[PDB]
Amino acid sequence: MDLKVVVSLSSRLYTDEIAKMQQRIGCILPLASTHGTQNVQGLGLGQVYSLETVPDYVSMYNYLSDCTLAVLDEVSVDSLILTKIVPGQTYAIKNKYQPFFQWHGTGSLSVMPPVFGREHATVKLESNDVDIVFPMVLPTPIAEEVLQKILLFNVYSRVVVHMHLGSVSYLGHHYELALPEVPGPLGLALLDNLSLYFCIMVTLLPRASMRLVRGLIRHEHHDLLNLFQEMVPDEIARIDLDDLSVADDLSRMRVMMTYLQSLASLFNLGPRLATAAYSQETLTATCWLR
Amino acid sequence: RRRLQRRIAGLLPPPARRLNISRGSEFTRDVRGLVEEHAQASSLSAAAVWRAGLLAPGEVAVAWSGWRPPVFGDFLIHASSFNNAEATGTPLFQFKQSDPFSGVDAVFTPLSLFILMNHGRGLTRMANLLYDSPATLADLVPDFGRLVADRRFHNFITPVGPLVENIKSTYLNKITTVVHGPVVSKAIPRSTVKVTVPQEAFVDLDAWLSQPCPADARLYVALTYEEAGPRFTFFQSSRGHCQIMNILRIYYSPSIMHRYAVVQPLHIEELTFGAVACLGTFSATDGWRRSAFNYRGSSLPVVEIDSFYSNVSDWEVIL
Amino acid sequence: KIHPGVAMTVVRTDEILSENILFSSRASTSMFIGTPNVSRREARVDAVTF
Numbered sequence: 001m002d003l004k005v006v007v008s009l010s011s012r013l014y015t016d017e018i019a020k021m022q023q024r025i026g027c028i029l030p031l032a033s034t035h036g037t038q039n040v041q042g043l044g045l046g047q048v049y050s051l052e053t054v055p056d057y058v059s060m061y062n063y064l065s066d067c068t069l070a071v072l073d074e075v076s077v078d079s080l081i082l083t084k085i086v087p088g089q090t091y092a093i094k095n096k097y098q099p100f101f102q103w104h105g106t107g108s109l110s111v112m113p114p115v116f117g118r119e120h121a122t123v124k125l126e127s128n129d130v131d132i133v134f135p136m137v138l139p140t141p142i143a144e145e146v147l148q149k150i151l152l153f154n155v156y157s158r159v160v161v162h163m164h165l166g167s168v169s170y171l172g173h174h175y176e177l178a179l180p181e182v183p184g185p186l187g188l189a190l191l192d193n194l195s196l197y198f199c200i201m202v203t204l205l206p207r208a209s210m211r212l213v214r215g216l217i218r219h220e221h222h223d224l225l226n227l228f229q230e231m232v233p234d235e236i237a238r239i240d241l242d243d244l245s246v247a248d249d250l251s252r253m254r255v256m257m258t259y260l261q262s263l264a265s266l267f268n269l270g271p272r273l274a275t276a277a278y279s280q281e282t283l284t285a286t287c288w289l290r
Numbered sequence: 291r292r293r294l295q296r297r298i299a300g301l302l303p304p305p306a307r308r309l310n311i312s313r314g315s316e317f318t319r320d321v322r323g324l325v326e327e328h329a330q331a332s333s334l335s336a337a338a339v340w341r342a343g344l345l346a347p348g349e350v351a352v353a354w355s356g357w358r359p360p361v362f363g364d365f366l367i368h369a370s371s372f373n374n375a376e377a378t379g380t381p382l383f384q385f386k387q388s389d390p391f392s393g394v395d396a397v398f399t400p401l402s403l404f405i406l407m408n409h410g411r412g413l414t415r416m417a418n419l420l421y422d423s424p425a426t427l428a429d430l431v432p433d434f435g436r437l438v439a440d441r442r443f444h445n446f447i448t449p450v451g452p453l454v455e456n457i458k459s460t461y462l463n464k465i466t467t468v469v470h471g472p473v474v475s476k477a478i479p480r481s482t483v484k485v486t487v488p489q490e491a492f493v494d495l496d497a498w499l500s501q502p503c504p505a506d507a508r509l510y511v512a513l514t515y516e517e518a519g520p521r522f523t524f525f526q527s528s529r530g531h532c533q534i535m536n537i538l539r540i541y542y543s544p545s546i547m548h549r550y551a552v553v554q555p556l557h558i559e560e561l562t563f564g565a566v567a568c569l570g571t572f573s574a575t576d577g578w579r580r581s582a583f584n585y586r587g588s589s590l591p592v593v594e595i596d597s598f599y600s601n602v603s604d605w606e607v608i609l
Numbered sequence: 610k611i612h613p614g615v616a617m618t619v620v621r622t623d624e625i626l627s628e629n630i631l632f633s634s635r636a637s638t639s640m641f642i643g644t645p646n647v648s649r650r651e652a653r654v655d656a657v658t659f
Contacts, residue, residue, distance in 0.1 A: 001307070002649050032502060034504060034651075036650075047501070061532075062530075062533060065532060065533065066528065066530065068504050189540075204558050251559065255561070255562065258445075258562065261606060262535065265531060266536075268531060268532050269530065271530075306649075307648065308647075308648055309647050310644045321647065327657070357652050473654060473655075474655060596655075598654070599653075
C-alpha cells in the first residue's frame with residue numbers, strides 16, 4: 001500500500017520558514033481530506049483555532065478526532081511530503097515536541113490540542129498568508145491530567161489556587177498551560193454530560209462502601225485517606241444511618257460498572273495511539289492507530 | 291551462506307507501491323502485476339489450485355498486502371425463526387439463550403426483531419407479512435417482558451454483523467455471518483454484497499445536523515428503551531465515539547423526558563436509556579445509496595450500505 | 610413618506626459573467642513534464658482506489 005500525500009504550497013517560502021519547518025520533521029499533523037494532493041488550507045488546527053484570544057479546546061478535540069492524521073517527514077520549497085495514518089498500518093513516530101515529555105516504556109501516546117501556548121507549536125507561513133499549528137502528542141496519563149485540569153479550571157471559574165491547577169507536573173519538568181475563561185457551549189456540553197453521569201452516580205451509589213470508609217478513616221490512615229484530613233464528611237453522617245443489605249448493593253454495582261465504562265469512553269476524545277517499544281536513544285517508537 | 295541470499299530473495303519483494311506507466315492502451319505486464327490481486331475460489335485442479343495459490347501461508351501468493359481475510363461465524367436457528375426471503379446484506383443480532391448446553395442459537399434480523407417489539411402494543415406491515423405469527427418468535431426469548439422491565443436487554447444481545455450465505459435447510463437452518471473483516475460473499479461468481487437496513491428504522495446523523503470529511507464513516511446501532519416499546523434505530527456518522535455519545539444524547543433528548551414523564555423510575559435499574567455499539571466502518575463518500583426491497587406483496591424503502599467492513603464492539607450506555 | 614434630515618449613498622455591487630480572452634507570446638514559459646506514475650491508495654473491502 002502507498003500512503004503518500006503531497007501538499008502543494010500556493011506561493012513560495014522564505015528561508016526562515018524553511019529553517020523552522022525542517023526542524024519540525026516527524027511531528028503529527030492533521031489533514032483536511034484523505035485525497036492525493038491538498039493545499040495549505042485545511043491543514044493544521046489553525047482553521048478552527050484561529051489567530052484569536054479566546055480558545056475552544058473541545059472543538060479542537062472534535063476537529064482532531066473527526067479528521068485523519070499524518071506525519072511530516074520531507075519538507076522543501078513549494079512542496080512538502082506527508083505520510084498518512086490509517087488503521088491497520090504501523091508507523092514510526094519521532095519525539096520532536098519541545099515540551100520534552102519523556103515517554104514511558106510501551107505505554108500509549110495521545111494527540112492533543114496545543115495547550116502550551118499557540119506560539120509554541122506554530123509555524124507562521126506569511127508567504128501563503130496562513131498559519132499551521134502543530135498538535136501536541138504526549139502520553140495518556142499526562143493527557144488525562146491535562147484534560148481533567150482543563151475541566152476543573154472550567155468548573156472552578158465561578159468560585160475564586162490558580163497556579164496549583166493550571167500548571168502540570170511531570171518527572172521530566174513541570175509545565176504551564178494556556179487557560180481561557182469560557183470554552184463555549186461545547187465545553188459546557190462536556191460539563192453537561194459529565195454532570196449527567198455524576199448525578200446518576202450519586203443516585204445509584206452503593207452504601208456498603210460508605211459504611212466501610214467511615215470506620216476505615218476512624219481506624220486507618222493512608223495517602224488514600226489523608227486528603228479527608230481525618231475528618232468524616234457530613235453526608236457520611238447523614239447517609240450511614242441505614243442498614244446494610246446485600247441485594248440492593250449488587251443491584252447498584254450492576255449499573256455502576258455499566259455506567260463507568262461510558263464515563264471512561266467519554267474521556268476518549270482525541271485520537272489515541274497505543275505505541276510499542278519506545279527507545280530512549282532513538283527518540284522514536286513503533287506505533288499504530290488504536 | 292549463499293542460500294541465505296536466496297532466502298532473502300524469496301523474502302524481499304513488497305507489493306508494488308509505485309509504477310512509472312507510460313501509456314494506457316499498451317497494458318504492460320508490470321502494471322498487471324501491480325493490479326492483480328489473487329482470488330479465493332477456483333476450480334479443482336492441482337495446477338489450477340497452484341495458479342490460484344490458495345496453499346500459500348496466511349495470504350495468497352503464487353509459488354501483508356494491507357488486506358484482511360474475513361472470518362465466518364456459523365449459527366444454527368429454527369426454520370420458523372427466520373425468513374428465507376431475507377436479503378443477503380442485512381445485519382443480524384444474536385440473543386443468548388438460557389440453556390447451558392445449547393447448540394441451536396437464536397438470531398434476530400431487525401425485521402424479525404421489530405415484531406418482538408410491536409406485539410405488545412409500511413415497515414410494520416412488512417414485518418407482519420414476513421414473520422406472520424409473533425408467537426413463533428415470542429418464545430425464543432423466554433422472559434421478554436421481565437427483561438425489558440429491568441432494562442438488561444442490551445447486554446444479552448451481541449451484534450454479529452451482516453449475513454452472507456443461507457443454505458435453505460428444512461428444519462434447522464444454518465446461516466453464515468461475518469463477525470469481522472471484509473464482508474464478501476462465498477459464491478462461485480463472487481458477487482459484491484451490500485448491507486441493507488430498512489429506511490424507516492435508519493435515520494442519518496450527518497444530514498440530521500443539516501470541511502473535515504474522512505474516508506471511514508462508521509455505522510452505529512442503538513437499542514433504546516421507550517415506554518411505548520423499545521426501538522432499534524441505526525446511525526450513520528463520520529465522528530468519533532466521544533462525539534457519538536454526546537450527539538446521541540442530544541438526539542434522544544425528547545425521548546428521555548418522554549419516558550421520565552410517562553413512567554417514573556421507581557427502581558434503580560430503569561435509568562439506563564439504552565446503549566450503542568459500533569457495527570463497523572465503510573466508505574464515507576459512496577455511502578448509503580437507497581434501494582427497494584420487494585417481498586411478494588409489498589415494498590419497503592431500504593438503505594444499502596455498500597462494501598461494508600464489519601467490526602463489532604460492546605455496549606456503551608447512552609444515559 | 611417624509612424625508613429625514615440625513616441622506617444616504619446606496620453602495621452596491623454587481624456580479625457579471627464575462628468571457629475572458631487569454632493571450633500569451635510564443636515560448637514564454639519552459640516547463641518539465643514528469644513521469645505519470647500510478648499508485649495504490651486504499652484497500653476498501655470490495656474495491657481498491659488507485
